A paper describes a structure:
Like other β-coronaviruses, SARS-CoV-2 utilizes the trimeric spike glycoprotein on its envelope to mediate viral entry into host cells. Each protomer of spike protein in the extracellular domain is composed of S1 and S2 subunits, which are responsible for binding to host cell targets and the membrane fusion process, respectively.
To explore the binding mode of SPC-14 against spike protein, we parallelly prepared cryo-EM grids by incubating the same batch of purified SARS-CoV-2 spike protein with SPC-14 (at a 1:10 molar ratio) or without SPC-14 as a vehicle control on ice for 40 min. On the contrary, for the apo spike system, almost all the particles were in the open state with one RBD “up”, which is consistent with several previously described cryo-EM structures. The cryo-EM structures of the closed state spike+SPC-14 and the apo spike were solved to resolutions of 3.06 and 3.27 Å, respectively. Intriguingly, additional densities located on the three FFA-binding pockets are evident in the closed state spike+SPC-14 map, but not the open state spike+SPC-14 map and the apo spike map.
Residue numbers in the entry:
A (entry chain A): 296 to 624, 639 to 675, 689 to 737
B (entry chain B): 738 to 829, 849 to 1080
C (entry chain B): 27 to 70, 76 to 145, 151 to 181, 186 to 209, 215 to 249, 264 to 295
D (entry chain A): 983 to 1080
E (entry chain C): 738 to 786
C-alpha cells in the first residue's frame, strides 16, 4: 500500500487499480562452460629441448588454438625465477590469452637480472631488450649439468661492440668489423679493430655465477580481441530447470536450457528465428541441442478500496502461474485468465461490476473484506407471444433528464 | 522503458537517470489507449436493459428466422452466420519475442457475453416491434407489425394482406444468397483485416531496430563493456541511449494518431444501431439503398455486421395526367 | 567455347540456423547469366591447355571429366624463389600442402607410363626458408579403368583462405549450394594462379569465372537448406 | 567556472535537451485540441434540432418520445434538459386483421 | 530522403546506413495519405450509374 503513495506522490488514494512496479528473479549460478575441446598447448616442446639459441640470435614460436594447463610442470620442472607483469598469477586459470609468443635464449648466471623493463647491461644494450609497456611473465632456471663439459664449451656467443643502443624487440644478426678509432679499418683486423662478437666459457667447476641459464619470455594481450589460448573452469553439466548465467564459446546472458528436437547441421553452430533473437545453441563438448527461455519479466499492480475506509489491499501478478511467485515476497489463491490474484476469495453469486480486472471478472469491497465475482449482464424476461393477442397502454408519465458536453478549453502561450 | 533500453545492466541505469522523467510520460500515454478501447464496445452493444428469449413454437406467418438464431450444438451458442465470419479473418515470433518487455492484455468482455447481447436485440425486435426501446415490451403478431411498417412508406395495408405468400417466398429466397456469397469468397471481409495487419507490422520494426549501432563499436551492450576503458565507454554508451530513445517516441506518436479514427468509426455504429434497428428511418441512403423496412445485427471479430431489408419497384407503364 | 551459367554458384555465407525465413543478404556472388570461359583438353590434334589467369577477387572453378586428370593448382604472385607460394598437389597417395618459395618451370605436370602407375613428379627445383607443412593421410586411388562434377570457390580476406565444395554427379542445368570444406590462414599476397595436370605417356574440361558485389535473396527450408535464391538486379 | 572555448561544449546539451522537451508538449496539444472540436460540433447540431423544433430521430434527444428541451450554461460547457413521454399500465385483448 | 539529406556524395550514403530504417518508414506515410485524397473525391461525386 505504501508504494502507491510513493508512486503518485500523495497521502490519499481513491478507488481503482494502479500499476506500481515490476517483478524480476535474479539468476544465482554463474557458469563458464569453457569449450576446452582441443588438446593441451605444447608445454614440453617449449620448456625443455635438446639445444637452445644464443643471446644475439634468439627464437620465436607461435602457439595458438590450445588449452592452458600448466599443472604438468610440477612433477619434473624446478624453476628458479617467477615474476609476472600486468596480470595476477592466481587469476591465470580463469582468463584467455591472445597472440602469445615465446622466445628462447641462454644467458649467464649473474646476467639474469637484466631481463626486466628499465635495465642497463651488455645484453640489454646489444642483444635483447624489453618494452616499457610489458604484460607477461619471465621464468629462469639453471641448466648447469646439461650445458657443461670438460675443456669448456665454445658454441655460445654474444655481442661486445656496437655503434649505439638497441630497441625493444629488435633483432640484429649482422656481423661486421668495428672501427674503434679515427683510422678506417678497411675490412682488415688490426690496431683498434676487434671482432664485436665474442664467445662464452663454461666449466663444470665454475662458480655459482658462472654457470649457464635458460630463460623463456612470454607475452600476450588481455581482453581486447578474440583469443585462442585459454584456460578452463569446467563448471559444466548444469541443472535443466533453473535460470542461470551461461557463457558459451561466443555467447553470454541468462535463461533456462533444456533439450530440444531440432537438428543442427555440422556447418552451423547457433540458432535464430525470423526476429534477430538467440533461441538455440549447440554444446561444443557433448554435441547436443539446447534451448533458451526467459524467466525474469512481469508486472504487479495493487487494488485498493478507498484509502481511509480500510488499509487492506490485494495484489495481482500479471501473466504469472501461481507456482513461481511466492504468496508474499497465503491460504488465499485464486487463478484467473489474467494473472494470479492473492488476498481475495471466490464467491458464487453475481453482482454488477465495481472494479474491472479482465476476462469477465470484477472485484468489490463488502465485518468487511474483498471479494471477486463474475459480472452479470442483467435480469431475465420472456414475452408471451401469440398470433391473436395484443397489449395496449392506459396511462402515461412525464420525465426529465440531463446531459453534459464540453465546448472549449484554456488558451496559453509560451516564450 | 528500462528493460527495452538498458537491458539488464546497472552501468546503464545510472546514465539513464540523468535524462529526466522520460518513462512516466511514455507510459501514461499507452494506458490511455487501453481504457478507451474497452469503453468503445460498451456503447455499441450495451443498449438493452433486460434479456429476452423467443418462445419455442415458431409460427411467424411464413418467414424463416432459422439461420440467424442460436443453436446449442456448436459452442458459445453462436448462430450459423456468426460461425462463418470467424473462419475468414485470421489473427496472424509472438511466442517468444517478449524478450524485451512487451505485453498483451485481455479484453474485458469475453466473446461469450457479446453473443448474449446480440441474441437479445434480435429476439426482442421480432415479438415486440419498436416498443421495447422506449418503455416496456408489448407483444403483437408479425403479420400486423409488417403492415404497420408497410404503411410508413406510402403503400396501404391491403397490398400486403393480399400478397403474404409471395412476400414470404421472396424474403426466404433473398436470405440465403448471402450464405453462398460468404462461404465461397474469402475476400469479403476486407476492411477488418487492415486493423490487424497495420498493428502487427508496426510491432516488428521496433524489435528489428534493436540491432543497429548508432555510431558505436558494436550493437551489443557487452563488447563495449568487456574490452573498453571504464571512462571511455560512458562516451559511446551515451550514443546508444539517444538512438534507442528516438525510436520509442515515433511508435507512441503514430499509435496515438492512428487510434483516433477508430473512435470516429465506433461513434457511427452506436448511431446506426440506435436508428436503423430500434425504429424506422426516413433519411435517404442511410440504412441501405431504397425504402427502409427493418434490420438485423450480427457480431464479428473486432467489428459488427448489419443486414438491411428494403423495397424496390418495377414494371412501369405510360399514362396521361391533368392537374384538375 | 563461351557459355553463361544460368543460376549456378551459391555458397552458405552464414554459420547459424534458420527455419522458413526469407532473410536477404549482401555479399560477393557471381552475377546470374554471365558468360564464362571454356577450356578443352582432348586428344583426337592433341589439346593441352594450362595458361596463367588473373585472380582479381575469386574464381568459381568447376571441373567435368570421366577420369581424374586435374590434380591441383599453383598459386603466388610472381612464382619464383623470391616470393612464397601455396602448393596444393595431389600425388595419388596423399594430399600435399606446403607454403614455400618454390622454383617452378614453364610446364610442371605429372604423368604416367603405362598397370597405370605414376612415373614422374616435376613441379619445383628449390624451396627454402619456409615454415609450413601439412601431410594428409595416405590413400590408394584407381587410375582410368562425363559423369561427375566438382565445384570450388576461392577467397582470401584478412589473411584467411576459404574453400567451399560439393560433389554431385557442357555443364548441366542443375542448382546446388556450397558448404565450407577447409580453412587455412596464410596472410600472403595472391595475384595469379595456374593449374597442373597429368598425361598418359604422350606428348601434347573446366571453366573459370568471376564475382561481383551484388545482393541476393535467400529462401531457406525447414531443415535449414537453401532451396531457391533469387537475385535483385537482373530484370525489373 | 569555465573559459570561453571550453564552456561552449558544456552548453550544447542543455539547449539540446530543453529543446526536445518542448516539441513533445506542442505535439500532444495538437491532438487534444482535435478531440474537442469534434465535440463542439455535436453540441451545435443538438441545439438546432432538439431545441428549435421537434425531432423524430430515435434516442437523439433523450429517451422515449421527444416533446421539448431547455438549455443551461456551465463553465466551459453546456447542460440540456429533455422532456419525454412514457406509457404505463398495459392490458390484454384480442385482434383480427379484417 | 537520400537526395534531400546529403545530395549525391558517396561519403554520406555509407554513414546513413547505420541508422536503421528511419527513412523507409518516412516514405510510407506520404503514400498512405496520397491515396485517401484520390478516394475522397469519389464518394462525393460518383453517386450515379
Ligand atoms: C473517506 O472514505 C469515506 C468512505 O467511507 C468517504 O465517504 C470520505 O469522503 C473519504 N474522505 C474524504 C475526505 O473524502
Ligand atoms: C460455491 O460453489 C462451490 C462449487 O460450486 C461450492 O463448493 C461452495 O460450497 C459454494 N458456496 C456457496 C456459498 O454456495
Ligand atoms: C557472352 O560472352 C561475351 C564475351 O565475348 C560477353 O561480351 C557477353 O556479354 C556475354 N553474354 C552475356 C549475356 O553476358
Amino acid at each position: 500500500l505504501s508504494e502507491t503513495k510513493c508512486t503518485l506522490k500523495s497521502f490519499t488514494v481513491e478507488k481503482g487499480i494502479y500499476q506500481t512496479s515490476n517483478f524480476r528473479v535474479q539468476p544465482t549460478e554463474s557458469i563458464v562452460r569453457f569449450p576446452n575441446i582441443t588438446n593441451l598447448c605444447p608445454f614440453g616442446e617449449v620448456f625443455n629441448a635438446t639445444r637452445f639459441a644464443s643471446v644475439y640470435a634468439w627464437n620465436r614460436k607461435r602457439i595458438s588454438n590450445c588449452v592452458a594447463d600448466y599443472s604438468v610442470l610440477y612433477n619434473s620442472a624446478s624453476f628458479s625465477t617467477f615474476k609476472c607483469y600486468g596480470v595476477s598469477p592466481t587469476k591465470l586459470n580463469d582468463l584467455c590469452f591472445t597472440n602469445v609468443y615465446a622466445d628462447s635464449f641462454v644467458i649467464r648466471g649473474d646476467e639474469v637480472r637484466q631481463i626486466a623493463p628499465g635495465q642497463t647491461g651488455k645484453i640489454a644494450d646489444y642483444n635483447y631488450k624489453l618494452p616499457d609497456d610489458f604484460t607477461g611473465c619471465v621464468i629462469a632456471w639453471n641448466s648447469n649439468n646439461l650445458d657443461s663439459k670438460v675443456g669448456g664449451n665454445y658454441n655460445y656467443l654474444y655481442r661486445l661492440f656496437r655503434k649505439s643502443n638497441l630497441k625493444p624487440f629488435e633483432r640484429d644478426i649482422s656481423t661486421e668489423i668495428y672501427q674503434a678509432g679515427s683510422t678506417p679499418c678497411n675490412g682488415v683486423e688490426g690496431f683498434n679493430c676487434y671482432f664485436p662478437l665474442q664467445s662464452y666459457g663454461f666449466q663444470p667447476t665454475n662458480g655459482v655465477g658462472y654457470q649457464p641459464y635458460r630463460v623463456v619470455v612470454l607475452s600476450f594481450e588481455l581482453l581486447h580481441a578474440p583469443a585462442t589460448v585459454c584456460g578452463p573452469k569446467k563448471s559444466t553439466n548444469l541443472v535443466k530447470n533453473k535460470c542461470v548465467n551461461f557463457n558459451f564459446n561466443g555467447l553470454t546472458g541468462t535463461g533456462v536450457l533444456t533439450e530440444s528436437n531440432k537438428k543442427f547441421l555440422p556447418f552451423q553452430q547457433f540458432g535464430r528465428d525470423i526476429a534477430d533473437t538467440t533461441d538455440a545453441v549447440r554444446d561444443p563438448q557433448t554435441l547436443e541441442i539446447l534451448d533458451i527461455t526467459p524467466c525474469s519479466f512481469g508486472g504487479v499492480s495493487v487494488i485498493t478500496p478507498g484509502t481511509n475506509t480500510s488499509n487492506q489491499v490485494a495484489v495481482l501478478y500479471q501473466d504469472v502461474n501461481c507456482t513461481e511467485v511466492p504468496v508474499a515476497i497465503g491460504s488465499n489463491v485464486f487463478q484467473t485468465r489474467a494473472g494470479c490474484l492473492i488476498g481475495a476469495e471466490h464467491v458464487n453469486n453475481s453482482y454488477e461490476c465495481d472494479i474491472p480486472i479482465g476476462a469477465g471478472i470484477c472485484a468489490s469491497y463488502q465485518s468487511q473484506s474483498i471479494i471477486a465475482y463474475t459480472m452479470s449482464l442483467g435480469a431475465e424476461n420472456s414475452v408471451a407471444y401469440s398470433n391473436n393477442s395484443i397489449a395496449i397502454p392506459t396511462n402515461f408519465t412525464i420525465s426529465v433528464t440531463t446531459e453534459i458536453l464540453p465546448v472549449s478549453m484554456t488558451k496559453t502561450s509560451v516564450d | 522503458c528500462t528493460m527495452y533500453i538498458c537491458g539488464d545492466s546497472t552501468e546503464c541505469s545510472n546514465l539513464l537517470l540523468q535524462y529526466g522523467s522520460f518513462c512516466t510520460q511514455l507510459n501514461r500515454a499507452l494506458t490511455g489507449i487501453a481504457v478507451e478501447q474497452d469503453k468503445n464496445t460498451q456503447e455499441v452493444f450495451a443498449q438493452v436493459k433486460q434479456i429476452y428469449k423467443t418462445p419455442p413454437i415458431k409460427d411467424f406467418g411464413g418467414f424463416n428466422f432459422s439461420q440467424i438464431l442460436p443453436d446449442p450444438s456448436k459452442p458459445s451458442k453462436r448462430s450459423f452466420i456468426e460461425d462463418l465470419l470467424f473462419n475468414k479473418v485470421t489473427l496472424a515470433l509472438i511466442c517468444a519475442q517478449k524478450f524485451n518487455g512487451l505485453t498483451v492484455l485481455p479484453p474485458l468482455l469475453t466473446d461469450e457475453m457479446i453473443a448474449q447481447y446480440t441474441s437479445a436485440l434480435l429476439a426482442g425486435t421480432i415479438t415486440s416491434g419498436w416498443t421495447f426501446g422506449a418503455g416496456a415490451a408489448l407483444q403483437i403478431p408479425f403479420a400486423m407489425q409488417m403492415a404497420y411498417r408497410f404503411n410508413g412508406i406510402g403503400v396501404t395495408q391491403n397490398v400486403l394482406y393480399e400478397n403474404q405468400k409471395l412476400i414470404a417466398n421472396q424474403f426466404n429466397s433473398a436470405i440465403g444468397k448471402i450464405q453462398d456469397s460468404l462461404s465461397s469468397t474469402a475476400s469479403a471481409l476486407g476492411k477488418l483485416q487492415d486493423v490487424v495487419n497495420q498493428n502487427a507490422q508496426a510491432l516488428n520494426t521496433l524489435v528489428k531496430q534493436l540491432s543497429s549501432n548508432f555510431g558505436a563499436i558494436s550493437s551489443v551492450l557487452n563488447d563495449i563493456l568487456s574490452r573498453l576503458d571504464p571512462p571511455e565507454a560512458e562516451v559511446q554508451i551515451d550514443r546508444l541511449i539517444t538512438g534507442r530513445l528516438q525510436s520509442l517516441q515515433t511508435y507512441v506518436t503514430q499509435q496515438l494518431i492512428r487510434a483516433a479514427e477508430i473512435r470516429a468509426s465506433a461513434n457511427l455504429a452506436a448511431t446506426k444501431m440506435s436508428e436503423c434497428v430500434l425504429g424506422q428511418s426516413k433519411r435517404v441512403d442511410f440504412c441501405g439503398k431504397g425504402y427502409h423496412l427493418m434490420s438485423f445485427p450480427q457480431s464479428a471479430p473486432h467489428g459488427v455486421v448489419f443486414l438491411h431489408v428494403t423495397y424496390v419497384p418495377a414494371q412501369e407503364k405510360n399514362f396521361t395526367t391533368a392537374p384538375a | 567455347a563461351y557459355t553463361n551459367s544460368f543460376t549456378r554458384g551459391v555458397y552458405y555465407p552464414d554459420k547459424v540456423f534458420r527455419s522458413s525465413v526469407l532473410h536477404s543478404t549482401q555479399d560477393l556472388f557471381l552475377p546470374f547469366f554471365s558468360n564464362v570461359t571454356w577450356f578443352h583438353a582432348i586428344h583426337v590434334t592433341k589439346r593441352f591447355d594450362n595458361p596463367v589467369l588473373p585472380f582479381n577477387d575469386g574464381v568459381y572453378f568447376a571441373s567435368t571429366e570421366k577420369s581424374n586428370i586435374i590434380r591441383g593448382w599453383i598459386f603466388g604472385t610472381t612464382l619464383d624463389s623470391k616470393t612464397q607460394s601455396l602448393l596444393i598437389v595431389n600425388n595419388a597417395t596423399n594430399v600435399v600442402i606446403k607454403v614455400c618459395e618454390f622454383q617452378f618451370c614453364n610446364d610442371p605436370f605429372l604423368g604416367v607410363y603405362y598397370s597405370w602407375m605414376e612415373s614422374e613428379f616435376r613441379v619445383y627445383s628449390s624451396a627454402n626458408n619456409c615454415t609450413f607443412e601439412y601431410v594428409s593421410q595416405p590413400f590408394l586411388m584407381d587410375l582410368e579403368g562425363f559423369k561427375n562434377l566438382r565445384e570450388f570457390v576461392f577467397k582470401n580476406i584478412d589473411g584467411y583462405f576459404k574453400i567451399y565444395s560439393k560433389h554431385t554427379p557442357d555443364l548441366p542445368q542443375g542448382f546446388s549450394a556450397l558448404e565450407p570444406l577447409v580453412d587455412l590462414p596464410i596472410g600472403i599476397n595472391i595475384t595469379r594462379f595456374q593449374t597442373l595436370l597429368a598425361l598418359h605417356r604422350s606428348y601434347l574440361a573446366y571453366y573459370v569465372g568471376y564475382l561481383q558485389p551484388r545482393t541476393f535473396l535467400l529462401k531457406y527450408n525447414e531443415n535449414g537448406t537453401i532451396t531457391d535464391a533469387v537475385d535483385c538486379a537482373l530484370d525489373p
